[PDB]
Amino acid sequence: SGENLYFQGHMHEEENVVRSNIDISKISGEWYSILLASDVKEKIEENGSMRVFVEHIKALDNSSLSFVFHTKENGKCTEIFLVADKTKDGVYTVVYDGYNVFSIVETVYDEYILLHLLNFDKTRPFQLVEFYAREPDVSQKLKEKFVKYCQEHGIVNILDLTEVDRCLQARGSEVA
């Protein structure tokens, strides 16, 4: 006798984690910048060009993606509008502080996006890893996931943005 037990689920571990065949409509909407990492720490510390705080992602056509960010310039939150062009599933290019490529590494559409960017500056090229979430903070488990990804890629300058000025106060342009 005893309770018969039965395997349930799939063999791989993660639930609803999307790594390819990205559905753009479901990654659209409101996002918050949570974590930022780089191999060049100056790019993400205060005054760094890549210290940008995402606001919204929108599908533009069957290819391109609109990204709206805030960044700090001359003491103020300023809104910056970017259009990223698709080169293949999950991969885009965009011009900002030079020429960039970036990849949607992994996403849970209603929770988070992990993005890995390369910038091709001739003198000081760099990599950026970003973690966006559907809320302004995330679980410790997800922060550890991000940190492990960074470590696996040799990226050791890792900032948690959730207790510093991310220009949240600048997101109130539109009312219900």
From Swiss-Prot:
The keyword Protein biosynthesis does not apply. May be a pheromone carrier. Acts as a kairomone, detected by the prey vomeronasal organ and inducing fear reactions in mice. Belongs to the calycin superfamily. Lipocalin family. Abundant in urine (at protein level). This is Allergen Fel d 4. The keyword Glycoprotein applies. Glycans are attached at residues 47, 62. It is found in: Secreted. It comes from Felis catus (Cat). Keywords: Allergen, Behavior, Disulfide bond, Glycoprotein, Secreted, Signal, Transport. One of its GO terms (molecular function) is odorant binding. Gene3D superfamilies: 2.40.128.20. Disulfide bonds join 77-167. One of its GO terms (cellular component) is extracellular space. InterPro entries: Calycin, Lipocalin, Lipocalin_CS, Lipocln_cytosolic_FA-bd_dom, Maj_urinary. PROSITE patterns: LIPOCALIN. SUPFAM superfamilies: Lipocalins. Pfam families: Lipocalin.
